[PDB]
Amino acid sequence: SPHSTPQGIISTFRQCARFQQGKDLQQYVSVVVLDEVGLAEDSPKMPLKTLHPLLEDGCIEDDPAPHKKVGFVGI
Amino acid sequence: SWKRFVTQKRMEHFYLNFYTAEQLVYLSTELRKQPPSDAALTMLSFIKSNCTLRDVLRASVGCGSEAARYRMRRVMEELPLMLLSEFSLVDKLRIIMEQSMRCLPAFLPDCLDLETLGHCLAHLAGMGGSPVERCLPRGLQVGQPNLVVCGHSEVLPAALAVYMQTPSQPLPTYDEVLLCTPATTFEEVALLLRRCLTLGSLGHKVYSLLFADQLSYEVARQAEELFHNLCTQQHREDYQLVMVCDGDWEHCYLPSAFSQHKVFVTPQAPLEAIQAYLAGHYRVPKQTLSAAAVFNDRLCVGIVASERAGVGKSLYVKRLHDKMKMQLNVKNVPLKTIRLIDPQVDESRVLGALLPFLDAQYQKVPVLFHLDVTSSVQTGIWVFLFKLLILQYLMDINGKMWLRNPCHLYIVEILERRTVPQFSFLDIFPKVTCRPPKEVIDMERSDTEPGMDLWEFCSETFQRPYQYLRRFNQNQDLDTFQYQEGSVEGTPEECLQHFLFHCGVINPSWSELRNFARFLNYQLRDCEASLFCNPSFIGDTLRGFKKFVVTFMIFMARDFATPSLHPFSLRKRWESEPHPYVFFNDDHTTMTFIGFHLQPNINGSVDAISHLTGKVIKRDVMTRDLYQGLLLQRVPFNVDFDKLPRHKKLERLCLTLGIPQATDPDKTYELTTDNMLKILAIEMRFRCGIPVIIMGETGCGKTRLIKFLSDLRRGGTNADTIKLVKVHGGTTADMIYSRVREAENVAFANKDQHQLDTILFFDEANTTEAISCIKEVLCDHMVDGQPLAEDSGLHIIAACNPYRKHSEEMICRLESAGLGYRVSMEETADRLGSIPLRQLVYRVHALPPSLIPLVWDFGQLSDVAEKLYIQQIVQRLVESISLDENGTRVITEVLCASQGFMRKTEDECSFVSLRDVERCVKVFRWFHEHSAMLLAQLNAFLSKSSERDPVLWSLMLAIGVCYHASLEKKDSYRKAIARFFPKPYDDSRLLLDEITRAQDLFLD
Ligand SMILES: Nc1ncnc2c1ncn2[C@@H]1O[C@H](COP(=O)(O)OP(=O)(O)OP(=O)(O)O)[C@@H](O)[C@H]1O
Ligand SMILES: [Mg+2]
Secondary structure: OOOOOHHHHHHHHHHHHHHHOOOOOOOOOOEEEEOOHHHHOOOOOOHHHHHHHHHHOOOOOOOOOHHHOOEEEEO | OHHHHHHHHHHHOOHHHHOOHHHHHHHHHHHOOOOOOHHHHHHHHOOOOOOOHHHHHHHHOOOOOHHHHHHHHHHHHHHHHHHHHOOOHHHHHHHHHHHHHHOOOOOOOOOOOHHHHHHHHHHHHHHOOOOOOOOOOOOOOOOOEEEEEEOHHHHHHHHHHHHHOOOOOOOOOOOOEEEOOOOOOHHHHHHHHHHHHOOOOOOOOOEEEEOHHHOOHHHHHHHHHHHHHHHHOOOOOOOOEEEEEEHHHOOOHHHHHOHHHEOOOOOOOOHHHHHHHHHHHHEOOOOOOOHHHHOOOOEOEEEEEEOOOOOOHHHHHHHHHHHHHHHOOOOOOOEEEEEEOOOEOOHHHHHHHHHHHHOHHHOOOOEEEEEEEOOOOOEOHHHHHHHHHHOOEEEOOOOOEEEOOOOEEEEEEEEOOOOOOOOOHHHHOOEEEOOOHHHHHHHOOOOOOOOOOHHHHOOHHHHHHHHHHHHHHOOOOOOOOOOOOOOOOOOHHHHHHHHHHHHOOOOOOHHHHHHHHHHHHHHHHHHHHOOOOOOOOOOOOOOOHHHHHHHHHHHHHHHHHOOOOOOOOOOOOOOOOOOOEEEEOOOOOOEEEEOOEEEEOOOOEEEEEOOOOOOEEEEEEEEHHHHHHHHHOOOOOOOOHHHOOHHHHHHHHHHHHOOOOOOOOOOOOOOOHHHHHHHHHHHHHHHHOOOEEEEOOOOOOHHHHHHHHHHHHHOOOOOOOEEEEEOOOOOOHHHHHHHHHHHHHHHHHHHHHOOOOEEEEEEOHHHOOOHHHHHHHHHHOEEOOEEOOOOOOEEEEEEEOOOOEOOHHHHHHHHHOOOOOOOOOOOOOOEEOOEEHHHEOOOOOOOOOOOOOOOEEOOOOOHHHHHHHHHHHHHHHHHHHOOOHHHHHHHHHHHHHHHHHHHHOOOOOOOOOOHHHHHHHHHHHHHHHHHHHHHHHHHHHHHHOOOOOHHHHHHHHHHHHHHHOOOOOHHHHHHHHHOOOOOOOOOHHHHHHHHHHHHHHHHO
């Protein structure tokens, strides 16, 4: 939503990562689904900025790890 | 009940209104201590300047009435009985609440009640010097709430004129002036109104509420209510209250409420009077030890400004600090630098940075504060400067307060963001204007118009090129000349004249001239150290060598020094210019020539030609005699590196770089002449000291080239000689500083153990405003104001994404997708000036103007390199999954065709790169793995609806997912791709059919 903050997206990605932790990533996957992304596009909070790192590795400042790379669909 | 109690006590005690609730809690706790905190004493200073423990102790006497101790003792005796009389917890709590409002010291003996604090503050105020007696200008009435309505630019000067009426009275502070903002809380306005109307004060001060229009509706309403209420009660019948608003916003609540009071004679003063007033108040007496002594007229505040970058602001501050260390005879003079990076000034960061200095040791010691307002800052600057420089204060509601001490010097480094009044606000301040070289020659000593710094003019960097050029222009003999270290010749004017003449730029900054001089100095040093200039060792075979060296190096500098850029005025190309490079190898015996050939002409001279086109680049670089002599020395002229073997290329490269071993770390990287020139350029810049900022599309080869160079220099040693940081919009300044410091430590370690230099690389730096911090690292050679450690072996590289705009058709597709954008391009705040960011191909912010002259194009990715990278990727796939040659050919040709079609389709795709091909190959691989099972299901599924090569099938579905789906004109893509598929698969219809059958199989 226009009021969604970066922390919401970060916590969503982190939760998907916690789900992927400890499992075989060739048989299990966790996906992040964002609904109504366009609403956040030009909000003053600019949450979508976080997407670039989180899509690449799954971490903004944390060190890379396999379980942090989750799937993603934005609708 | 507590709120009523606080309001009543605030009416009974005047000085409590100087502070808020949390500030009062802080003071109540601290003052009982021995000694109080320096913060508390600073907070009190706004009532009694230079408040000390002795002042608080003297003020405490009398306020501690014995009647208060009687009340305390009585309540301490009574409360046990009162609480025993009531049984419910809620009644006990109510009793406690009442008794706490009656006598708090009985409960909290370590804290002052509001009454004792009020008395102490009043005693402090009365111990002070003379009261402030101010007079209102003509047109403004005492006892009446006056209102002024003006243009934004006039708001601040007008308030200043109000106080100008009494130029002998001290400048005001937060007590007298409040600058309103949308975030301004009701507590601040309420305390201002209480200070104006309430009694208890000793003088007729003036109270101003500026930019009132910005106040929120709720705050303005509450302020009006409080104002009227105060006027109903026993109040000051001679109060002087002024509101100032922006005429454009006059329609809002506060300007409307007081429209009747509107005054039509707007106060104003000439710029000269404001200048003299501020200068007088800033002037520090002779007896007070202060930093100001170095400044022009003992002014404790000063501005350093320029019309463009690289003109000596930071240098001026450095020279000022040195002069202060020399003149003041003090063992040390602390220097604090503060960098303002955020577009909206964050006063809390500045306050946090300054707070460490509140300690008493600094209160009577020369200290210099340097505030750098980078180009990133766009808003909040004039308010901040008004508050700190004029109102002498900074504050957060948290309670901590900074007061500007006259024993300290404050210098602001800013670029003149002039865009309307008759003068800019900065002009009111004492200002130093730094000029570029050409203005320095033309207009010219003064202390506000600095010219050529004498330490630089006497440096090797300027002197060696200066002496060489001085002899060169007069055609004097250079064969015998030799620069003696420390020698000095000529004057600053002739040095500037020669540099500007040969520089190549018309109106250069000082940084550009420094980079030119540094380059020519480095290469002339290498020339002097070579054997061709050693004690004779040649007889006289090399007549004119230095003349040629000077001419050619003056030409070569054109590439490194000259800009490469000319709202979106930022682009130029790399292939548009020749890259003739000459290097003096560390062996002092050989030279390397790249990027050009030497051709003898009929004129008896030798000309420079392009190795590719053969066209003349520059004529008369040398005479034929020198050319023959250099050939007799076996100098590699007219070499064609493109035809040489791989190992010969590697050897020439390692020799020129100074590497001893040609250990090939990557046989796949193609060592073409262009890549070798690019490497040699980055090397030269690392060597001479010029920052490296590159501009290029993604996938053009920056990362691979840097990795190849790092590996080649590493020589197989197990060390992390390179750190790559991928910058993004979320990359803050702290992340950059931490990465730089970690890289500096790693570089020191690598240099100590393995004697290896370290590279730090920032990719997509422009994506964030923190890019301005990267400027500090590259040009200023500092980190958060702290200087970098030289000789650590750390080199920094930055890559900038290009500034491109989507086509209009593509922008239409974007604006038309779905229900359209939630915000219109006009209302957007995410914009690069006039252009919204969503219309850009890369989300990039503006470059700091100091970096603009340094950026150079890395070059576009040619079709041949694209095809070769595709071939490498397909071959890796072949090895991984056992493909044949036919499939390899088909995949390569089809991926090339897809990239070409998407590049041509400017109405649907603006961004094309090699990463997409990796993505598509990944999809192909996945389809191949499952291809066995999925096709079986397909055969079953299709049997319900009553032969395929897994490779071409997986290719079809990969193309479908990666390219076919994103497109709208799918038919053209399928038509183009079909040509490359073997028969009978060379039909767009069959591709669509197979994609559809797969989609069906998946829905089943
Ligand atoms: N007379 C001179 N005036 C200014 N700079 C000089 C002079 N002589 C040599 N220089 C060189 O020019 C460079 C000027 O850098 P400076 O710190 O002035 O940039 P700046 O004014 O802070 O620009 P920006 O704030 O945009 O970075 C210095 O590195 C210095 O070595
Ligand atoms: Mg500077």
